[PDB]
Amino acid sequence: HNELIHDAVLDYYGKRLATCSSDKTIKIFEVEGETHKLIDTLTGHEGPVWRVDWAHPKFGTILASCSYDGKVLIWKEENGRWSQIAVHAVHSASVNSVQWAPHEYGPLLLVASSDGKVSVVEFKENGTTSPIIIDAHAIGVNSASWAPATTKESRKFVTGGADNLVKIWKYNSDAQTYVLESTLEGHSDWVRDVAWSPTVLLRSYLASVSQDRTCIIWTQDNEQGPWKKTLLKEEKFPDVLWRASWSLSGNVLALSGGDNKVTLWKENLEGKWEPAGEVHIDNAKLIMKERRFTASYTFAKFSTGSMLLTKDIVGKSGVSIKRLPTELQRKFLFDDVYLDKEIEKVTIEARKSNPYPQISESSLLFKDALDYMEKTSSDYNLWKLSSILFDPVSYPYKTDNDQVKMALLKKERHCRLTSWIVSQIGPEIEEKIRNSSNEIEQIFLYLLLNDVVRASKLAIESKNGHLSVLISYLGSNDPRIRDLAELQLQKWSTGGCSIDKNISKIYKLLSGSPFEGLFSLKELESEFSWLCLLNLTLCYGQIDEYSLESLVQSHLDKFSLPYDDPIGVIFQLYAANENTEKLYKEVRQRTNALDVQFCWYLIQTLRFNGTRVFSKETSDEATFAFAAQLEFAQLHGHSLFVSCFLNDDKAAEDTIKRLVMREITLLRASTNDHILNRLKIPSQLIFNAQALKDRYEGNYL
Amino acid sequence: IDPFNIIREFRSAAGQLALDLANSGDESNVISSKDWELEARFWHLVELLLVFRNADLDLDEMELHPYNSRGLFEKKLMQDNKQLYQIWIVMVWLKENTYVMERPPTSKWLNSITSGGLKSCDLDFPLRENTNVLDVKDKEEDHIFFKYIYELILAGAIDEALEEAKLSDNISICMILCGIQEYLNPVIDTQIANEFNTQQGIKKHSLWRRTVYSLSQQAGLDPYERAIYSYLSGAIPNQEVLQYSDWESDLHIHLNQILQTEIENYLLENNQVGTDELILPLPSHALTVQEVLNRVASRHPSESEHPIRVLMASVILDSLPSVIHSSVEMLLDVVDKPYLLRIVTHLAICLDIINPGSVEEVDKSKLITTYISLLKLQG
């Protein structure tokens, strides 16, 4: 065998660990890096200790633990000395779940048991104490969790029981207790655990793990609306699931299965969840057995640091504190100089429902994020293009009419695009010109490089003259020439003439429409990149008649494109202007091809330049994602900045507050002239947290 | 007080004397009346070059259009250099004077397709690569064709020209002749929005020109066809094609000097022309008109001798006054003399009604005497 436990919990700052195994004992650890320091063992219990949990560090150093002896204990550290400070045993059966309510509710503890009851106990040495109790379930209550704070009326907590149900309660003033508010009959066996979502978005989230191997997530918009049920996945898991813990930020769902493995989960625009970064006797038998408890007991609760704790054997206490799998990867992010010069491009202003800062004016262009990259890494291509499509071109010297300033902008942006399609198609065509013993074909290829010059020059050296003159009628979209092309070709048909294949094609580039003509060019799908086909209808197509946007679109209607191409998808946006937002959701629903950071910078830079239409709801969605990514990577600085771009004030407050309270000593003067102050972060917020941690490091030192 | 009110009635009769040849010419009267139709065409060049005097030139100055880089400054650089436009006025006058014949040829390359393995070749352009696989009849039906086009392009009937080069299914050809008529790009250019209504031109014509010239000097193809190309670029029409020269060697050798300054101009401004656009070399000939009428004088089979052609010569050089004063010298000498040709003295009264009228830039003595002697020696 080897060290095996049941539960564990980190505190507000994650410098103190706790473990409770079937050895009827607890173990308090001082965590400092990849090491694990043991301080003292706890001998109090008479049975297998199930779970533990810390209380907010504004009430001191306290720990609660429950066991098979149906007795919840409350431990506290006084100048180092550990001692049982109180006791709460009012259950005839075994206790299961213990969790401290949000600090706004004072020193309040929740307790569930197998006797089918749930109790809420108030501890105050000076203040008065008034316990509560409720008959929650039929066969017992496996667990219960506190809901995020929001008037003591808005206090709700979810419960799970071995009767297969998930009940929700609410603190009623009249009844002097927590009355039933909702029942949710979506399981078919023992509910092992239920956790409420610390997230702050308009929708609430609940996660119920079952013994029948299922997992339901319940959502709710309205405050009195119907709890929408939704299976995590339509097929049932391998083994029996136990725990369900949410991340403090990002609305991540860590899930602990019976296959000894932990499986992460995140949500999409759809609501359907796609998996995130994967990571990983004597009288005692009966005890375990009456608990329908298997030998494969894994667990995973998130920590204040939005980190994931999980049982292993790799550690002096079989509790790994791995950092989240930051799928997002960008080199320039880890730089402090990027954050600094990025703030300046902004004008920060506090909202009308709270002092919490939020972006009012932004001059962020794609160009910006190009200096911090290489002109080689695949990204620079994806980016620089967006920087030529959606970036508001500017013309130095103003002009008489507003239409003239327009057609010039219409033109300069047009040339940038095509002068880029060259840079990329470059090697593709250049190497297809070596493989050619047809000097004329060497022309049609040189025309895919938008180089009429070296194209016509070649036409003459080809010993044939006329075409060389017609090549010079290319860039311009003269109507009478697009007309003649179609007429010259129609008089090829009747003649039964046999024109050199690649000479009739050059003729097809004059008809302003090569991919739909009589002598069509759709055939070229075979050897030429889809991009290159596009480059044609962009240079020799009807530049003047249509709009640069529309045109690019009228090429897609001719071909499907790489269903999974970053650069290819970008265009599809540029394509449909009026429905650009409708198609963005249509995109991410089908392909994870646009970076998490990109989706934000994309929809955000477009909403502060007046380029397209954007729903606040959507903007926030991709702003949440990016704000968490950086945070998991421990760059709370840049994490904070992005959170600013949040449109729901009630949300920002929670996201910002919590992020700052936990990580203050890392958000100080030592980093770029008080980053938190340069963001217009509330004065009271800083002071509330600054002295909060000071209260902690006192008891610790 | 336009003095041309009397002249207009000379020019009227001069032209109606051209019509007495058609009926029953065929004697000395068809020849002597080739002089009458020459007078009339002179009274016209006179009637319209004089007209060239101050005319609301101020508000003409277009200044909100420069910097445009529209490549279409012909409208301006033909309005600021009054000299070049003067040239042009002559050309249009010469154009309305070219002949225009008509002869019985459709379906392009007929007999060559039916018989020749030119089916692989198929197209004109792709042919020059094979030297001598043009069959007989075709190479001739195409010849008469470019004789009708060179003749008709000279006359500046460009419009009616493409309407025929299409009727013969020779559309590939027709296309090329659209770079010459447009020879630049008008689009969203403000001052011009009242004419075009749409984008109807071809950029890089300064680049395209040096192309069609590369076509004119390849020589593999028809003599006439090869000649019409050069016109549109420069004035080196194949000598085998320069047999004919009404005063067309005039009309062309001038187009030389004009579409050159034109080029060297839009070049000077860096406004319409890219550096890498110039493929084929082309010289900037300072072909001063006074020197061009002189090099053309060796191609004047005593065509620079005729009374009327000495006069069209001065009218072009604005040295019309010194001509009237160098002439009086003779009428004083009476010591043979061209002023005893029935035709020249009616043109001395030209110099009698204009000079005082336009600038009053002719002595009252040189005038007065040639009024007298004229009304004296009449028949």
Swiss-Prot record, chain A:
UniProt source species: Saccharomyces cerevisiae (strain ATCC 204508 / S288c) (Baker's yeast)
Residue positions, PTM Phosphothreonine: 294
Membrane topology listed for this record: Peripheral membrane protein
Superkingdom of the organism of origin: Eukaryota
Residues of the full protein shown: 738 to 1158 of 1317
Stated name of the protein: Nucleoporin NUP145C
Subcellular location: Nucleus, Nuclear pore complex; Nucleus membrane
UniProtKB/Swiss-Prot annotation, chain B:
Highest taxon, organism lineage: Eukaryota
Membrane topology, record value: Peripheral membrane protein
One Gene Ontology term of the molecular function aspect: identical protein binding
Primary location: nucleus
GO biological process terms, semicolon-separated: double-strand break repair; mRNA export from nucleus; mRNA export from nucleus in response to heat stress; nuclear pore localization; nucleocytoplasmic transport; positive regulation of DNA-templated transcription; positive regulation of transcription by RNA polymerase II; post-transcriptional tethering of RNA polymerase II gene DNA at nuclear periphery
Entry keyword set: Coiled coil, Membrane, mRNA transport, Nuclear pore complex, Nucleus, Protein transport, Translocation, Transport
Function of the protein: Functions as a component of the nuclear pore complex (NPC). NPC components, collectively referred to as nucleoporins (NUPs), can play the role of both NPC structural components and of docking or interaction partners for transiently associated nuclear transport factors. NUP84 is involved in nuclear poly(A)+ RNA export, in NPC assembly and distribution, as well as in nuclear envelope organization.
Extra remark: Present with 8580 molecules/cell in log phase SD medium.
Subunit record text: Component of the nuclear pore complex (NPC). NPC constitutes the exclusive means of nucleocytoplasmic transport. NPCs allow the passive diffusion of ions and small molecules and the active, nuclear transport receptor-mediated bidirectional transport of macromolecules such as proteins, RNAs, ribonucleoparticles (RNPs), and ribosomal subunits across the nuclear envelope. Due to its 8-fold rotational symmetry, all subunits are present with 8 copies or multiples thereof.
Family to which the UniProt record says this protein belongs: Belongs to the Nup84/Nup107 nucleoporin family.
Name of the featured protein: Nucleoporin NUP84
Species: Saccharomyces cerevisiae (strain ATCC 204508 / S288c) (Baker's yeast)
Underlying gene: NUP84
Residues of the full protein shown: 33 to 424 of 726
